[PDB]
Amino acid sequence: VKDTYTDRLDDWNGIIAGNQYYDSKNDQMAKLNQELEGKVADSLSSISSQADRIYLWEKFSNYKTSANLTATYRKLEEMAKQVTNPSSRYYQDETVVRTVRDSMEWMHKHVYNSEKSIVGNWWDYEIGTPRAINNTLSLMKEYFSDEEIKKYTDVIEKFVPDPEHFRKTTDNPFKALGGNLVDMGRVKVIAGLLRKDDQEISSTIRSIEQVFKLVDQGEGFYQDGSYIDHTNVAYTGAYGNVLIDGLSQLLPVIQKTKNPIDKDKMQTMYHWIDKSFAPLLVNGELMDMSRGRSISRANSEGHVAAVEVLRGIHRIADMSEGETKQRLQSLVKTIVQSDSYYDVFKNLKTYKDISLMQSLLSDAGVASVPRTSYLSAFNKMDKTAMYNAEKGFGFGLSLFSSRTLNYEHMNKENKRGWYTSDGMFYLYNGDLSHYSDGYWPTVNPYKMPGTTETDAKRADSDTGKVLPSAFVGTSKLDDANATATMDFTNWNQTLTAHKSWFMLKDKIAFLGSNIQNTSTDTAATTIDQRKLESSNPYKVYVNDKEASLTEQEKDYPETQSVFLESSDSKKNIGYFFFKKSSISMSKALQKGAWKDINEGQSDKEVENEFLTISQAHKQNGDSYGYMLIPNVDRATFNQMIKELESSLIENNETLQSVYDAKQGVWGIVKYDDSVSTISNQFQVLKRGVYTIRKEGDEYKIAYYNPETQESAPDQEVFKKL
Ligand SMILES: CCCCCCCCCCn1c(-c2ccc(OS(N)(=O)=O)cc2)cc2ccc(OS(N)(=O)=O)cc21
Ligand SMILES: O=C[C@H](O)[C@@H](O)[C@@H](O)CO
Ligand SMILES: O=C[C@H](O)[C@@H](O)[C@H](O)CO
Ligand SMILES: O=C[C@H](O)[C@@H](O)[C@H](O)CO
Structure with missing residues (x-):
């Protein structure tokens, strides 16, 4: 009708x-x-x-x-x-x-x-x-x-x-x-x-x-x-x-x-x-x-x-x-x-x-x-999204805490997303196809970019978990600057690490301290696992000298920098190690099928070439510290690492901080309530995350206590000298 x-x-x-x-x-x-x-x-x-x-x-x-x-x-x-x-x-x-x-x-x-x-x-x-x-x-x-x-x-x-x-x-x-x-x-x-x-x-x-x-x-x-x-x-x-x-x-x-x-x-x-x-x-x-x-x-x-x-x-x-x-x-x-x-x-x-x-x-x-x-700090779901329009790159920080599950594996889907929220980072650049064209079924699930893990075998039948700690969060100052931290502990409580990130407009600093391992497994942080394009090959430089990568892992002790050079500057990626570090790299073809990570998907084989960079942590008390600098050419990158020579303020078990002199911005993470004097200019007083900017004799402050999910009155956490 x-x-x-x-x-x-x-x-x-x-x-x-x-x-x-x-x-x-x-x-x-x-x-x-x-x-x-x-x-x-x-x-x-x-x-x-x-x-x-x-x-x-x-x-x-x-x-x-x-x-x-x-x-x-x-x-x-x-x-x-x-x-x-x-x-x-x-x-x-x-x-x-x-x-x-x-x-x-x-x-x-x-x-x-x-x-x-x-x-x-x-x-x-x-x-x-x-x-x-x-x-x-x-x-x-x-x-x-x-x-x-x-x-x-x-x-x-x-x-x-x-x-x-x-x-x-x-x-x-x-x-x-x-x-x-x-x-x-x-x-x-x-x-x-x-x-x-x-x-x-x-x-x-x-x-x-x-x-x-x-x-x-x-x-x-x-x-x-x-x-x-x-x-x-x-x-x-x-x-x-x-x-x-x-x-x-x-x-x-x-x-x-x-x-x-x-x-x-x-x-x-x-x-x-x-x-x-x-x-x-x-x-x-x-x-x-x-x-x-x-x-x-x-x-x-x-x-x-x-x-x-x-x-x-x-x-x-x-x-x-x-x-x-x-x-x-x-x-x-x-x-x-x-x-x-x-x-x-x-x-x-x-x-x-x-x-x-x-x-x-x-x-x-x-x-x-x-x-x-723009820069969004989605603290209620422990994720952070950043985008720089001037240089043209996006950045995603994937975390989890006692308030959120790390990864979802249900209905036989996402069988190997174990570490996708263990401080994993994403970089969105000139290669719009990076996370597409078979990325998920070919990426080595044991080495998700940015994560610190042991090499123990994991079962596909495992399911997500929440983090023991609530000390996970981001403190945003403006549209280009923010600081984040994650009081990390791995899935079986055998490894810990104070992981922090310092988003400074056109770069991101990765700091890790207090790395400990009580297992018999080897521990290491994956600096990156980038999917390559056969059309746009990267020319790799270590300490500014061309290096030839092979499927077999090569060690590079005393490394100060690594640069991935493309014909398109918007695809370049540079890593600057504040202190010379011992890393290893390789470039290899990785095969897999979507069915491997999702039962209802095709078993047809897929393959992609990946460039992996990692840093082993053989002793308790270990740490890592480097700056990710994308979308600049080689000569500019070399100039920037000189300007950033003394940007690392501290990286220990209670205090982590990076300073951007050009912007006049500080990123700070405090794990305790001791009085921390910074750059002989000011003091921060409380456990939490900070992003501060100096303008003249003025200080703009952005404080965040990730555990209570609250900011705080300026005088409670900041004091000028
Ligand atoms: C609302 C929060 C409740 C907590 C979880 C409760 C079940 C959520 C249902 C999820 N969900 C299911 C699903 C299938 C079977 C379930 O139980 S049982 N015993 O194993 O059979 C539970 C959930 C299938 C399926 C398909 C497509 C979806 O959609 S999509 N987006 O395309 O993936 C979502 C989806
Ligand atoms: O730059 C001035 C400072 O921001 C100051 O006003 C703080 O002590 C907070 O009131
Ligand atoms: O405080 C809100 C939390 O951040 C939130 O993530 C919840 O735990 C979700 O269940
Ligand atoms: O985040 C972990 C949850 O608390 C869980 O164990 C509950 O069963 C509800 O999903």
């Missing part, structure tokens, strides 16, 4: 498919149409069409694996999209119409109905499948009777009757929040429209509104921009994606129902965008340290995942007005245009999303200016 419910469903159809916007003369749109034509053709030629079959598709025949239900229904959703696309060869095709109808009936009678119970993954039974069923029925509502529609959605109500909880039919339900709460909307709001159920629609929207609240504990968004999910995991880049991606699709529909959301909370969305998402996007890539276990998915590398956020943003801009609309459009425009590696259209899967992106890119009224410098 035609009514306001169907009116909303028509809007939904224009969002999830957008056939009304299709234009065969539109190159990008035709490409997507071709993709869908191929998928439907494949499904039609392989579908089981014998009497009393056991499965619809052999590739997804074992219905014990919940993933097979969602996959099956998604094949029907693809058919629904094309059968309703006037330009498709399957438009109103009699076999396709009957196949969808017959397939819905078969699955209903033998695989997914109210009399069934969750077998496998609850997600498929409550979100994956219900969404696919909703979209299929919505798109093809003119071919189904209201009675059939209700019949096919009854199961959805059986598994998801309560808009505030998931896993309700199990012996351990949970309160829905964040991304999952948004999917609750794509499940019950649409099912509500299909079933013409006002109560379901209103109660679900009501529940959804929880997503706009600022939290100070648990899952959700924090005032500092952090986003936590799964109790205590940094997850802006995966669940946060779902939240903005799904919510941006629902909003247009929700605002036209009899239960619109107060237009005051959109300001809250704009805040998420600027404070939480934007900082994690560099040259079109979404920082992996925020994507949890999704880093182990081959079809979801950084640049691809980023599009989920970008399309969410451009949809939000479309429902906004005036300046807010234009500025959000500019944010999406400048990011996309700065991405010379990935084609954004490769992940825009509806005609409206393609259309929105095209108008934005061609609209001269929408400004596209290179993003300025």
